[PDB]
Design a binder for this molecule. Structure first.
Ligand SMILES: [Zn+2]
Lengths: 439, 457
């Protein structure tokens, strides 16, 4: 009952959750790495590696990996974030060991053929071109760049085209040698899984991994805490039909004691879409204002992003480049945050938000894959897994007061950073935002 | 069955109550009604859609606003959906809230108010929804396939309500539909992670005194006819490439038919997809449609095998999307693929193909069942249809015992037009397409040229 844990001699942590009445499972290897472990010339390597890890290992050619997974009915996948590198598999319980084997093989014994490395440069460029058509993604990459100015967290995951064209097999092997240490990784499993056996297979297939020489427990401080830099970037682009704005303030990290309170406050502001509404039976004064007299925007979305040592909390706005005065929708958002700071919120909306939050965090923990995802990410970024019942408790105890407290701390006399893409002439300044907000 | 911790019983009024699994981090529950577009006939067309869009509005004992708000406080993870053979109300909620959610479900299922305003709202909103559905080929083609496969009756009765019929859906027809189908004997209450004893308590408390209206039994068996149909080419947008589409099928099997596992394996062995297929291994790039079609012809942007299986009939076949220029080759390409599954002594199905397709089938079933909501829906529909829940073990075993000949025998049976379901369907093919009709050529002649289908009854 709950999540069993074990540490291998090289530092690797094995976290598992057995699911009764199942015959399948998910296993995944999580590494504290990602793009935040790269430098300016290095930037884009982790993602590049993710494409290559499927092109062949010292034990299996590309087509050999695919064909093997397909024959037993398993699934192989992976992703790179600013904080982690993750590879995972889904399979019938009989194939779990075959899965751990293949995961270790793909993560640590990848061939990295020079021909492959060149053919892929093109795939990544294509990839980057497509992301450029996703205005929300673009706005958020820029926001990260100016908010975490000249810091690791401020860099994108794909990296600049310049680096995508210059990354060498050396860069790749270097990144691997530097970051893949047992004390920086978690092997997480859920479903029809035997914790003891999974630990053995872990040692067998992952035991060869180098321990860092200066080991640090999974959730302990990397080094100097990222620092939130106030800033603004107006990216004028008069050809876009819609204008996209992101406004942020220093948020909360995964382990912050006020983590859930931050999410609860995000839920109290919520989202809105000009066509769909709020997704709630009763709209906040903000949602009502946004929809009034012709509408003030096309939509707005509250967001909270967390990292092991930092976080961003704010609003993402999409407006009609020809019909909306962005300044009007921004006034309303600030007014709403000030409403929270002033305590003018009902018990009902606070309980509505807690219910929404509980649902989003717990009812979504359905299959083994979502559960492995929660186990792996929590342990690799925090060093532990709060159980569904512990998370429920953390949300259930939140009070109207905790929220008011939290907003007055995080949204009063604090720096803000902002990015705008499209028709920028109607977009207000960052000092404008801070004036009205702190006012 | 046994490991499921599956239990089933009935209330005095005929309502079946099914529970399974053991306690967990949260629970799931739902009310399943044996209704759907196949039972609408011409008089109740569109009533299933409107009733499902009216789910959880005001009831006799709960104001609309209070309903909505209490559902939010419960987590908001609920929904009503309907299809050709089902109408279900489902949700997942925290363990302590099962009773409150069952109460709300029973209220909208037994005492909906359906005011003029609520009805006028859903009707207006349905016209817009129908206009959008007709722009999505992924939704339109399957609809045309069914309509022609059964000549617009039962399983082929429109799932998408004709636009011009929406304004005449009155409260009267909605009440007629409810009085015919919403009866305890035509309903199942299922729960996952809730002790059976507790489920009987709550069910008796909210649905126990519900009484039947003893309506006229109007459920017709599906009669597969086969047929053709073609709608005009879709408008050419901006950068998007222009594509023609075609779907070709034959009558398939009922979901409880003995050869259903062999048939699903065949569908997995053909597999296929979009010429893009984004994702890691295990996606099915080694299935025949990828190998013999996508990887061979790119004027083909999509090619996949479908298997619609219902209570008394089904449709099995292949879907293909291609550039207008290739249209003339579409039928033949598809006919060859079907032919090669049983009639080509040199392309017989191999141990490897069948073994892989088998594991992939077991895999998607089991992995999908990892979700409580899916376990719930699967249990509810199974009980609604044949009053029992086939246990997983049995399902797996029947798949593992399959051998190549089994798949070949079933492939031949389907493609030869030799299926004998209760409705005694013709062995004629169903061919439905979007593009200029001329571009596809003599469709019937190509299919006969491959010995597909059945001419003489
Ligand atoms: Zn990529």
């Amino acid at each position: 009952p709950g999540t069993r844990t074990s540490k291998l001699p090289n530092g690797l942590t094995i976290a598992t959750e057995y699911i009764p009445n199942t015959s399948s499972a998910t296993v995944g290897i999580f590494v504290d790495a990602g793009s935040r472990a790269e430098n300016v010339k290095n930037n884009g390597t982790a993602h590049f590696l993710q494409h290559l890890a499927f092109k062949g290992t010292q034990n299996r050619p590309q087509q050999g990996i695919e064909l093997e997974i397909e024959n037993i009915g398993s699934h192989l996948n992976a992703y790179t974030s600013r904080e982690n590198t993750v590879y995972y598999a889904k399979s019938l319980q009989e194939d779990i060991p075959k899965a751990v084997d293949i995961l270790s093989d793909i993560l640590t014994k990848s061939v990295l053929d020079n021909s492959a490395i060149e053919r892929e440069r093109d795939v990544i460029i294509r990839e980057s071109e497509e992301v450029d058509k996703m205005y929300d993604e673009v706005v958020f990459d820029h926001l990260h760049e100016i908010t975490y100015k000249d810091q690791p967290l401020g860099r994108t995951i794909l990296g600049p085209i310049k680096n995508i064209k210059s990354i060498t097999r050396t860069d790749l092997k270097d990144y691997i040698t530097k970051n893949y240490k047992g004390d920086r990784m978690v092997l997480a499993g859920a479903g029809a899984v035997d914790h003891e056996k999974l630990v053995q297979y872990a040692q067998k297939y992952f035991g060869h991994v180098p321990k860092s020489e200066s080991p640090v427990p999974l959730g302990s401080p990397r080094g100097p805490l990222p620092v939130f830099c106030r800033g603004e970037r107006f990216i004028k682009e008069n050809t876009l039909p819609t204008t996209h704005i992101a406004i942020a303030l220093e948020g909360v990290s995964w382990s912050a004691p006020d983590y859930f309170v931050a999410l609860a406050t995000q839920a109290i502001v919520g989202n809105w879409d000009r066509a769909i509404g709020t997704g709630t039976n009763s709209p906040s004064p903000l949602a009502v204002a946004a929809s009034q007299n012709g509408s003030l925007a096309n939509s707005y979305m509250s967001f909270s992003t967390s990292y092991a040592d930092s976080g961003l909390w704010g609003m993402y706005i999409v407006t009609d480049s020809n019909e909306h005065n962005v300044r009007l929708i921004v006034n309303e958002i600030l007014k709403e945050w000030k409403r929270i700071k002033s305590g003018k919120i009902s018990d009902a909306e606070v309980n509505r938000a807690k219910a929404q939050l509980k649902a989003a965090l717990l009812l979504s923990l359905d299959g083994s894959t979502a559960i492995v995802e929660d186990i792996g990410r929590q342990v690799v970024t925090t060093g532990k897994r709060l159980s569904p019942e512990e998370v429920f408790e953390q949300v259930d105890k939140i009070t109207k007061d905790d929220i008011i407290m939290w907003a007055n701390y995080r949204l009063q006399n604090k720096p803000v950073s902002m990015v705008a893409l499209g028709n920028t002439s109607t977009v207000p300044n960052v000092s404008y935002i801070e004036e009205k907000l702190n006012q | 069955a046994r490991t499921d911790n599956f239990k089933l019983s009935s209330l005095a009024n005929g309502l079946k109550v099914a529970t399974s699994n053991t306690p967990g981090h949260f629970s799931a529950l739902g009310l399943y009604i044996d209704a759907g577009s196949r039972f609408e006939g011409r008089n109740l067309k569109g009533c299933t859609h409107i009733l499902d869009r009216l789910a959880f509005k005001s009831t006799e004992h709960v104001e609309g606003r209070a309903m909505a708000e209490t559902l939010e406080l419960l987590g908001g993870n609920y929904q009503c959906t309907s299809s050709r053979e089902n109408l279900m109300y489902q949700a997942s909620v925290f363990n302590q809230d099962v009773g409150k959610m069952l109460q709300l479900m029973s209220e909208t299922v037994r005492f909906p108010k359906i005011t003029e305003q609520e009805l006028q709202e859903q009707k207006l909103s349905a016209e817009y929804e129908i206009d959008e559905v007709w722009m999505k080929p992924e939704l339109v083609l399957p609809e045309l396939l069914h309509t022609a496969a059964y000549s617009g009756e039962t399983l082929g009765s429109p799932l998408i309500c004709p636009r011009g019929l929406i304004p005449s859906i009155s409260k009267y027809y909605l009440l007629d539909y409810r009085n015919k189908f919403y009866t305890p004997e035509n309903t199942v209450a299922a729960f996952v992670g809730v002790p059976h004893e507790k489920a009987l308590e709550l069910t008796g408390k909210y649905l126990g005194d519900w009484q039947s209206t003893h309506p006229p039994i109007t459920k017709k068996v599906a009669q597969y006819t086969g047929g053709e149909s073609c709608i005009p080419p879709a408008p050419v947008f901006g950068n998007l490439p222009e594509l023609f589409h075609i779907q070709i099928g034959f009558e398939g099997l009922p979901i409880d038919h003995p050869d259903i596992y062999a048939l699903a394996t065949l569908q997995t062995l053909l597999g296929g997809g979009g010429s893009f297929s984004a994702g890691g291994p295990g996606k099915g790039m080694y299935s025949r449609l990828y190998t013999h079609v996508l990887n061979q012809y790119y004027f083909v942007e999509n090619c996949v095998a479908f298997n619609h299986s219902y209570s008394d009939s089904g449709i099995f076949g292949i879907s293909l999307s291609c550039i207008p220029q290739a249209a003339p080759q579409a039928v033949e390409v598809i006919a060859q693929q079907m032919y090669n599954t049983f009639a080509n002594k040199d392309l017989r199905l191999t141990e490897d193909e069948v073994s892989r397709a088998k594991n992939q089938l077991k895999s998607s079933l089991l992995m999908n069942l990892e979700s409580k909501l899916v376990e719930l829906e699967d249990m509810g529909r199974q009980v609604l249809m044949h009053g029992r829940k086939i246990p997983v073990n049995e399902m797996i075993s029947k798949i593992e015992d399959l051998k190549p000949d089994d798949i070949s025998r079933v492939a031949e049976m389907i493609f030869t037009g030799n299926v004998n379901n209760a409705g005694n369907g013709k062995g004629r093919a169903t061919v439905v397409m979007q593009g200029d009709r001329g571009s596809f050529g003599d469709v019937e002649n190509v299919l006969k040229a491959y010995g597909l289908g059945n001419s003489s009854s």
